[PDB]
Design a protein around this ligand. Structure first.
Ligand SMILES: Cc1cc2nc3c(=O)[nH]c(=O)nc-3n(C[C@H](O)[C@H](O)[C@H](O)COP(=O)(O)OP(=O)(O)OC[C@H]3O[C@@H](n4cnc5c(N)ncnc54)[C@H](O)[C@@H]3O)c2cc1C
Ligand SMILES: Cc1cc2nc3c(=O)[nH]c(=O)nc-3n(C[C@H](O)[C@H](O)[C@H](O)COP(=O)(O)OP(=O)(O)OC[C@H]3O[C@@H](n4cnc5c(N)ncnc54)[C@H](O)[C@@H]3O)c2cc1C
Lengths: 442, 442
């Protein structure tokens, strides 16, 4: 319904917040409303000593409903995966929006305190636009608009409904855990309640002192955990790498992928015949699954209409933003292997100018071609669908920056579009080396 | 045992941490060990979405054992009373240690994020000196030293014991809630599980939207809550002031003290015959009780030996620091109505020079006189025992600063002693006005 006036935003985290600012800066919408289940904005940057009550083991269903921790004396809490001693893996010269910088004397890879404070400051002017402690239950096109059903968080809230011209989903993709279904893991897990964990549960390393641990995974998250646990867990720390690894020291023993979990002997069978025993904790650092837990959108199975299948990615989203069949439904924040704030802002700026009619999306056929060419380059590896590892992210954010400049008419105040010059791209290229040196590792 | 070499510190919060630095700066002790039940230092500045599991209602026993939240997947969590949107009520020009300042561009009354980050930085060099996730169970003089019994926090830790020459208690006094035993409060509370709260449980104001609330108390904490709840709770907000109050608007109705709680009609009887009904939440902002939960010290009841009686204060502590009968037992952080970090540091510097023999405490008789004169000035109001409201705190911190200068010999590196000049004292005198104007209130 082209002339958009009432927009709904699902999520008040970094993505939803920059989406609101970009949208409001268009001066063309009469209503920009944000919905957030948490009592406060900032998404995951809301550190919680509280852990999830029940970790699905295994977890392969991207529809899984996030169950908050409730009590009679508190507001429902939605645990965040951030741990206590966490520090960014993204430099201050790159992370964060281009129109709000970090106070001087900030560490290059600061503690989450700094980023949580960052979000707080960024979100403040938007509090009157957000409906806090409110869970969006479903989203569907009814008649000529989108009907978003939502129940206020808090025991006894009544289910409510409101129509919108457009809807922007910024619900994040690090909530529903991904733990591959191995042989005998379910049983092994239920046998000893805290024996199997997922990165989303980690908080304080002191829990693992003296314990013999097995970290499964080889991505950044798993390597971080191996380092964090090195000074407390019993030596050596075991790590399961799909293809195995080269590190076999006294403190780190990389081993190949897992074959089976023997519940009766509690032995862990690794490919190649190697067997592990007396493992106090097994920690799955195998990431998450994308999720669109809204019945009206989840039922869509059709190749041309579906959004979610296995949770490896969100399908049918041109440029990772607009739902091809109906571009009044868009997503911001889907990007993988990027610098979240700048990339989400890049998408927001573009999204804003497209929904206010100051920019035109190419034909539906060409959008589908973009998708076709992308799928082909993935070679069956759909979980790389949204991945924009450098230089893809740089090219991408600069591509959106140049499409925005073409917006018309030119507003007196133009919501900024980030752009990565030669100096920025360089830092992004050696980002992990800059990080490694900063923390003295690798 | 004068020549002190091995010192134990109970608590790794602001008080315990500055105590460690001061102690280690004396270069006279062979062992300075800190004990902390939490997995990390910083005391209350460890924000926790987690609330206490069972709020005693009423609460009048200062011996009450703090029960952490346990689970099989996490380290035991000791909930802190800090709420989500909290900002200091102490200016950056005054709070914080004199040898570590706030980064530039910090708000004068910053968010807890800033202070939590502050503590993190301050505590880092002390991590190797702290025994984390370890609860001290008891403290007693055995033979010629102090035997501190402690059990590692974490299911299945074995009870351990270690002897020390001196022990410094910095366990804080904002844990054990104080809720006066009124007529029919226990029953009224147990009838509807979340009907009665204490400030230590507050976290997110959105919980109280639409609810009719009664804040009981008139101190700073209660006024803060009244303001925080004004934009969400049903109007008006009720506040119970011991002597009643002058504000009776549409949003705030101050009423006199509570007489009885009628459990069958759930009506709240206020002195003067006024009666309240349909009160969804009653929130006690009546502070805390001091606590010395160590059997060997709690059993002491004697006028000349006792430490705790009703929890209104810690008795027999000269200058609020040294246990008169045995000055090898000291307390830091007991001060009330002060600026915590500077005041605790002031005491630490003094404590350090007294335990290393570079300063001499006056006779036992004179110490007891100091106490006698203090008790007399309190006029039965023992809960004002440690209160050093300006200008007492200024005079006090400057008094300790001048006694420290007299230490001998002069060390190459002297642990700083804070001093409040004319400029500092002025800010401390109008502290609440400076705060009121900063937040635009009063
Ligand atoms: C362990 C960890 C470490 C990280 N470290 C970094 C780092 O160093 N640097 C970096 O750049 N990024 C880091 N990230 C990435 C992080 O995702 C981003 O910084 C940031 O979270 C971007 O968030 P967003 O708004 O897209 O999503 P964030 O209930 O995920 O999320 C969304 C918000 O929408 C809400 N929401 C979702 N669905 C609903 C619904 N149906 N109803 C109501 N509310 C809903 C959520 O509860 C939340 O408040 C890390 C993340 C993790 C988990
Ligand atoms: C709601 C609130 C707001 C505040 N706002 C401010 C403010 O704006 N400015 C300000 O200056 N102050 C403020 N304060 C005051 C605050 O007390 C101080 O900033 C700071 O906490 C000083 O702490 P400490 O080390 O003396 O105690 P903090 O388990 O209290 O405490 C002690 C530490 O010792 C540990 N411990 C105690 N007993 C044991 C044991 N037996 N075994 C093991 N560990 C033990 C504790 O668990 C903790 O980690 C506020 C406090 C509250 C509760």
């Amino acid at each position: 319904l082209p002339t958009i006036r009432k927009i709904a935003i699902i999520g008040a985290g970094p993505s939803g917040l920059v989406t609101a600012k970009a949208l409001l800066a268009e001066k063309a919408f009469d209503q920009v409303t944000l919905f957030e289940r948490r009592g406060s904005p900032g998404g995951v940057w809301n550190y919680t000593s509280t852990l999830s009550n029940k970790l699905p083991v295994p977890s392969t269903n991207p529809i899984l409903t996030t169950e908050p921790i409730v009590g009679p004396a508190a507001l429902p809490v939605y645990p965040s995966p951030l741990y206590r001693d966490l520090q960014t893996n993204t430099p201050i010269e790159l992370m964060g929006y281009c129109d709000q910088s970090f106070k001087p004397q900030t560490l290059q890879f600061p503690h989450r305190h700094t980023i949580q404070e960052y979000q707080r400051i960024y979100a403040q002017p938007l509090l009157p636009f957000i409906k806090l402690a409110t869970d969006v239950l479903d989203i569907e096109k009814k008649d000529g608009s989108w009907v978003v059903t939502y129940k206020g968080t808090k025991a006894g809230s009544p289910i409510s409904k409101d129509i919108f011209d457009a809807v922007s989903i910024c619900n994040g993709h690090y909530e529903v855990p991904y733990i591959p279904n191995i042989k005998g893991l379910d049983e092994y897990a239920k046998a000893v309640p805290g024996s199997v964990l997922h990165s989303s549960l980690f908080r304080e390393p002191e829990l693992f002192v003296g314990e013999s641990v097995l970290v499964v995974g080889g991505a950044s998250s798993a390597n971080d955990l191996v380092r964090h646990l090195t000074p407390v867990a019993k030596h050596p720390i075991y790590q399961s790498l799909l293809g195995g690894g080269d590190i076999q020291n006294e403190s780190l023993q990389q081993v190949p992928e897992i074959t089976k979990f023997d519940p009766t002997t509690r032995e862990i069978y690794l490919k190649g015949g190697k067997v592990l025993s007396n493992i106090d904790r097994v920690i799955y650092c195998t990431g998450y699954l994308y999720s669109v837990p809204f019945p009206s959108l989840a039922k869509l199975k059709s190749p041309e209409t579906k959004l979610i299948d296995d949770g490896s990615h969100v399908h049918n989203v041109y440029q990772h933003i607009f739902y091809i069949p109906d571009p009044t439904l868009a997503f911001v924040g889907l990007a993988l292997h990027v610098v979240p704030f700048p990339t989400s802002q890049a998408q927001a700026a573009f999204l804003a100018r497209v929904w206010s009619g100051r920019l035109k999306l190419p034909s539906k056929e060409e959008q589908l071609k973009w998708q076709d060419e992308l799928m082909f380059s993935l070679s069956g590896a759909n979980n790389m669908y949204h991945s924009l590892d450098y230089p893809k992210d740089a090219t991408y954010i600069n591509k959106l920056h140049d499409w925005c400049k073409q917006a018309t008419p030119v507003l007196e105040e133009e919501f900024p579009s980030p752009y990565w010059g030669e100096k920025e791209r360089s830092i992004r290229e050696n980002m992990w080396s800059i990080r490694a040196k900063f923390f003295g590792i690798e």
